[PDB]
Ligand binder design. Sequence first.
Ligand SMILES: *[C@@H]1O[C@H](CO)[C@@H](O[C@@H]2O[C@H](CO)[C@@H](O[C@@H]3O[C@H](CO)[C@@H](O)[C@H](O[C@H]4O[C@H](CO)[C@@H](O)[C@H](O)[C@@H]4O)[C@@H]3O)[C@H](O)[C@H]2NC(C)=O)[C@H](O)[C@H]1NC(C)=O
Ligand SMILES: *[C@@H]1O[C@H](CO)[C@@H](O[C@@H]2O[C@H](CO)[C@@H](O[C@@H]3O[C@H](CO)[C@@H](O)[C@H](O[C@H]4O[C@H](CO)[C@@H](O)[C@H](O)[C@@H]4O)[C@@H]3O)[C@H](O)[C@H]2NC(C)=O)[C@H](O)[C@H]1NC(C)=O
Ligand SMILES: *[C@@H]1O[C@H](CO)[C@@H](O[C@@H]2O[C@H](CO)[C@@H](O[C@@H]3O[C@H](CO[C@H]4O[C@H](CO)[C@@H](O)[C@H](O)[C@@H]4O)[C@@H](O)[C@H](O)[C@@H]3O)[C@H](O)[C@H]2NC(C)=O)[C@H](O)[C@H]1NC(C)=O
Ligand SMILES: *[C@@H]1O[C@H](CO)[C@@H](O[C@@H]2O[C@H](CO)[C@@H](O[C@@H]3O[C@H](CO[C@H]4O[C@H](CO)[C@@H](O)[C@H](O)[C@@H]4O)[C@@H](O)[C@H](O)[C@@H]3O)[C@H](O)[C@H]2NC(C)=O)[C@H](O)[C@H]1NC(C)=O
Ligand SMILES: *[C@@H]1O[C@H](CO)[C@@H](O[C@@H]2O[C@H](CO)[C@@H](O[C@@H]3O[C@H](CO)[C@@H](O)[C@H](O)[C@@H]3O)[C@H](O)[C@H]2NC(C)=O)[C@H](O)[C@H]1NC(C)=O
Ligand SMILES: *[C@@H]1O[C@H](CO)[C@@H](O[C@@H]2O[C@H](CO)[C@@H](O[C@@H]3O[C@H](CO)[C@@H](O)[C@H](O)[C@@H]3O)[C@H](O)[C@H]2NC(C)=O)[C@H](O)[C@H]1NC(C)=O
Ligand SMILES: *[C@@H]1O[C@H](CO)[C@@H](O[C@@H]2O[C@H](CO)[C@@H](O[C@@H]3O[C@H](CO)[C@@H](O)[C@H](O)[C@@H]3O)[C@H](O)[C@H]2NC(C)=O)[C@H](O)[C@H]1NC(C)=O
Ligand SMILES: *[C@@H]1O[C@H](CO)[C@@H](O[C@@H]2O[C@H](CO)[C@@H](O[C@@H]3O[C@H](CO)[C@@H](O)[C@H](O)[C@@H]3O)[C@H](O)[C@H]2NC(C)=O)[C@H](O)[C@H]1NC(C)=O
Ligand SMILES: *[C@@H]1O[C@H](CO)[C@@H](O[C@@H]2O[C@H](CO[C@@H]3O[C@H](CO)[C@@H](O)[C@H](O)[C@@H]3O)[C@@H](O)[C@H](O)[C@H]2NC(C)=O)[C@H](O)[C@H]1NC(C)=O
Ligand SMILES: *[C@@H]1O[C@H](CO[C@@H]2O[C@H](CO)[C@@H](O[C@@H]3O[C@H](CO)[C@@H](O)[C@H](O)[C@@H]3O)[C@H](O)[C@H]2NC(C)=O)[C@@H](O)[C@H](O)[C@H]1NC(C)=O
Lengths: 235, 284
Amino acid sequence: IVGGSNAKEGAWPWVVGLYYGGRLLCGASLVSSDWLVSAAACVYGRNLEPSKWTAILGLHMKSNLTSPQTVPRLIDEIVINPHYNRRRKDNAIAMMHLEFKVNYTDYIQPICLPEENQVFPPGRNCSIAGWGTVVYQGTTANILQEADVPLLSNERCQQQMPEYNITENMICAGYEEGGIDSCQGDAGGPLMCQENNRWFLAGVTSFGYKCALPNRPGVYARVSRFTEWIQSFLH
Amino acid sequence: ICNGSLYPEPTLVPTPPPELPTDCGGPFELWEPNTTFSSTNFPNSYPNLAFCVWILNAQKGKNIQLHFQEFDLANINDVVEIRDGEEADSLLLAVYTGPGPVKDVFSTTNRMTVLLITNDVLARGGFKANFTTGYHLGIPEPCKADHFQCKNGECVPLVNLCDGHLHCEDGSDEADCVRFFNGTTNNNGLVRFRIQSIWHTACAENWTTQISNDVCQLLGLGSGNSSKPIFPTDGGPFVKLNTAPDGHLILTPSQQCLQDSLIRLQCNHKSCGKKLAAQDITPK
Ligand SMILES: *[C@@H]1O[C@H](CO)[C@@H](O[C@@H]2O[C@H](CO)[C@@H](O[C@@H]3O[C@H](CO)[C@@H](O)[C@H](O[C@H]4O[C@H](CO)[C@@H](O)[C@H](O)[C@@H]4O)[C@@H]3O)[C@H](O)[C@H]2NC(C)=O)[C@H](O)[C@H]1NC(C)=O
Ligand SMILES: *[C@@H]1O[C@H](CO)[C@@H](O[C@@H]2O[C@H](CO)[C@@H](O[C@@H]3O[C@H](CO)[C@@H](O)[C@H](O[C@H]4O[C@H](CO)[C@@H](O)[C@H](O)[C@@H]4O)[C@@H]3O)[C@H](O)[C@H]2NC(C)=O)[C@H](O)[C@H]1NC(C)=O
Ligand SMILES: *[C@@H]1O[C@H](CO)[C@@H](O[C@@H]2O[C@H](CO)[C@@H](O[C@@H]3O[C@H](CO[C@H]4O[C@H](CO)[C@@H](O)[C@H](O)[C@@H]4O)[C@@H](O)[C@H](O)[C@@H]3O)[C@H](O)[C@H]2NC(C)=O)[C@H](O)[C@H]1NC(C)=O
Ligand SMILES: *[C@@H]1O[C@H](CO)[C@@H](O[C@@H]2O[C@H](CO)[C@@H](O[C@@H]3O[C@H](CO[C@H]4O[C@H](CO)[C@@H](O)[C@H](O)[C@@H]4O)[C@@H](O)[C@H](O)[C@@H]3O)[C@H](O)[C@H]2NC(C)=O)[C@H](O)[C@H]1NC(C)=O
Ligand SMILES: *[C@@H]1O[C@H](CO)[C@@H](O[C@@H]2O[C@H](CO)[C@@H](O[C@@H]3O[C@H](CO)[C@@H](O)[C@H](O)[C@@H]3O)[C@H](O)[C@H]2NC(C)=O)[C@H](O)[C@H]1NC(C)=O
Ligand SMILES: *[C@@H]1O[C@H](CO)[C@@H](O[C@@H]2O[C@H](CO)[C@@H](O[C@@H]3O[C@H](CO)[C@@H](O)[C@H](O)[C@@H]3O)[C@H](O)[C@H]2NC(C)=O)[C@H](O)[C@H]1NC(C)=O
Ligand SMILES: *[C@@H]1O[C@H](CO)[C@@H](O[C@@H]2O[C@H](CO)[C@@H](O[C@@H]3O[C@H](CO)[C@@H](O)[C@H](O)[C@@H]3O)[C@H](O)[C@H]2NC(C)=O)[C@H](O)[C@H]1NC(C)=O
Ligand SMILES: *[C@@H]1O[C@H](CO)[C@@H](O[C@@H]2O[C@H](CO)[C@@H](O[C@@H]3O[C@H](CO)[C@@H](O)[C@H](O)[C@@H]3O)[C@H](O)[C@H]2NC(C)=O)[C@H](O)[C@H]1NC(C)=O
Ligand SMILES: *[C@@H]1O[C@H](CO)[C@@H](O[C@@H]2O[C@H](CO[C@@H]3O[C@H](CO)[C@@H](O)[C@H](O)[C@@H]3O)[C@@H](O)[C@H](O)[C@H]2NC(C)=O)[C@H](O)[C@H]1NC(C)=O
Ligand SMILES: *[C@@H]1O[C@H](CO[C@@H]2O[C@H](CO)[C@@H](O[C@@H]3O[C@H](CO)[C@@H](O)[C@H](O)[C@@H]3O)[C@H](O)[C@H]2NC(C)=O)[C@@H](O)[C@H](O)[C@H]1NC(C)=O
């Protein structure tokens, strides 16, 4: 997000937006015909009234919501991962159920999920996207921003951010020189890697100390450790 | 040179800042005789930025049921967290916030933890609740006389387990009777159908590509890839799968088949992150 570049039409068909209260608050990713994956940290106190949540499909430009290229949708059921604490910021993954089935088109496509024993080795570029603030002070009301960050080992992640246990349930991506981050404004963005020419889902954006801060990257939750929970009701 | 200001210019009297929020704690872990308890000042209000832990204890083998007689809290800023284990791992189960009535919460073990999160503004009256415990309050008793229980507890003799259509109002028979058994990965496995409770293959008397694709679709995967049997090892009540004019599959059990074999299918993956952006290719 921070320091990113403008995306192209249909570049990220699997990224969807979530609207509550009339403004975008958190991002989500399309997996199945009627399910989405989003960070559980943002959708914590707003899960009791799914009717007020509006699901936006293919929100390439935030200025067009009623455009024919954008398919509005409503949220029916919100499911939060039980093993969430809000204290360690662990297992910040949530699943949302769409009221109606969503068709797949050129600009609306699903995303892959990690399989068993599928761990991305560190040092690989992985793409990120979101509609969050790109300057850490202003606001984002323009085209979707995209960026690519490399995967960093958790051993260095714990040292560079001596505030959380991190453990093996989190994956950290960023640049030691700083300037690129996606943990501001829109924390629902997905962490996307490239395994073969089919693409994959790696993680979901989570808490970040500060954007563009030197040697202070973001935190992502490994979807590979939540694949079973997602598939338990993916249908 | 300005001088002569021999007067107490800062006439304003400073006041201590409203710092040190800390927490009040309130009631702690209590047994069954303790049922009704206010948070800290439930009839009036609650302090801002206060964190409290309430633990409900029950005898081994029992569960805990909540009943909030009055629930009037602030907006989404303030939430209430519910935990069961609080030993090595805990589950949220249910999170309640906002004014209005809330549904009951049933613990999954013999312990329940209630947590309060408060902001610095918009303090409301609070909330209160009591518990009575019991044996499987949230778990209905399964029906005897050969009845199958669904996810939500509804029990039926046999109107489910991959019939022509689900004869259940709840309709929680998401799991199918066809699964990959004795396979090598998620997409590779042997075809095993289950009429009622017995797993069996579908033979290869008239196996075609259309039925293979239909089976792959029923397994939540893509098209049929590498459809070829190797050798038979099962000895159960094998059924016959044949092509049908409609989109459904028909399984006819028969143990008098000839040249029986176990069919191994490698169904392709479903739709994935395939970009369809139309951009010019740079000739470099
Ligand atoms: C998402 O995509 C689905 C398609 O996968 C789409 O479903 C379509 O819905 C319409 C309206 O409910 C169905 O009605 C059709 O309307 C046309 C209009 O001329 C008719 O010609 C069609 O008749 C043919 O198709 C029938 C099968 O449905 C045949 O039985 C019939 O003999 C004719 O050959 C038909 O009445 C339409 O069939 C489906 N499409 C399907 C099932 O493929 C849905 O509307 C999309 N949703 C959104 C929000 O865009
Ligand atoms: C599933 O795939 C496997 C291949 O991976 C396939 O092969 C069978 O594997 C089982 C073990 O997994 C074999 O069972 C053994 O067979 C020998 C043959 O003499 C027996 O002596 C063994 O007996 C032991 O186990 C008994 C029960 O636990 C004990 O009572 C006894 O004392 C021994 O400890 C054991 O049963 C089996 O032989 C092979 N081959 C075949 C043809 O079964 C397996 O067949 C596949 N499953 C199906 C349903 O086809
Ligand atoms: C978000 O919504 C916006 C609507 O407020 C979109 O703006 C519109 O974008 C389209 C292109 O997708 C523009 O259409 C262009 O029109 C010019 C000239 O208009 C001609 O129109 C007819 C032909 O249809 C012709 O008979 C007239 O004489 C004009 O010459 C064309 O030259 C272009 O090729 C293109 O068709 C709209 O003008 C534009 N409207 C406004 C009010 O800006 C915006 O595109 C949407 N976002 C995205 C990413 O598509
Ligand atoms: C929740 O349930 C609790 C358990 O029923 C309630 O607390 C109990 O309230 C009764 C009220 O009479 C207390 O009874 C008193 O017990 C003391 C015990 O001796 C004390 O002194 C010795 C030292 O000699 C010390 O070791 C003990 O720990 C006690 O502190 C008697 O001396 C009195 O005469 C009287 O019988 C119970 O003691 C008390 N339980 C506990 C564990 O304190 C409680 O009121 C209920 N409600 C709430 C909001 O908690
Ligand atoms: C994907 O990963 C590759 C790693 O090979 C990244 O390529 C590297 O990008 C950095 C800048 O982000 C380059 O640093 C500078 O490059 C200039 C021009 O070559 C050079 O003159 C400077 O001295 C400095 O090295 C670096 O060269 C480049 N290549 C390597 C091998 O490190 C790439 O940025 C990542 N992202 C994308 C979208 O490709
Ligand atoms: C997963 O990645 C592999 C590459 O490691 C992809 O294989 C590649 O597929 C393309 C598409 O056909 C091949 O391009 C073709 O190459 C032949 C020469 O071999 C050329 O004559 C054609 O005109 C075309 O350019 C490419 O060679 C091939 N690379 C290999 C085999 O190393 C594979 O498609 C990817 N999987 C998916 C599902 O996309
Ligand atoms: C916490 O303590 C309260 C004490 O009132 C328990 O309330 C109980 O609520 C049930 C309703 O679910 C009451 O049954 C009612 O009986 C009246 C009799 O006329 C009937 O008209 C109603 O339709 C209903 O059946 C019950 O009487 C009431 N208890 C008492 C002592 O009055 C509450 O259940 C306790 N919380 C938990 C979790 O057990
Ligand atoms: C599954 O494959 C077997 C292959 O042996 C099929 O067996 C035989 O298939 C023929 C198809 O023409 C059936 O029709 C018969 O054709 C002869 C041709 O002269 C005709 O004289 C007979 O009166 C009859 O119409 C035949 O009944 C069938 N069984 C035999 C020969 O014992 C089988 O049909 C295939 N299954 C399906 C559902 O098609
Ligand atoms: C079943 O799945 C397998 C997955 O491994 C598919 O294998 C694909 O194999 C091709 C290899 O064909 C290429 O053909 C080129 C000439 O057109 C030749 O130059 C090249 O060396 C190679 O032989 C490979 O490129 C793909 O990456 C493999 N995977 C996929 C997903 O295509 C196989 O095609 C699948 N079969 C069916 C019927 O679906
Ligand atoms: C972040 O991790 C903290 C880890 O500190 C230690 O963690 C171990 C793990 O079990 C605790 O048990 C020890 O286990 C050792 C074997 O691995 C034993 O040799 C040792 O005797 C002890 O049993 C240990 O108590 C704990 N503390 C210390 C001082 O070693 C953990 O303490 C934090 O809570 C955790 N932060 C969280 C969960 O937010």
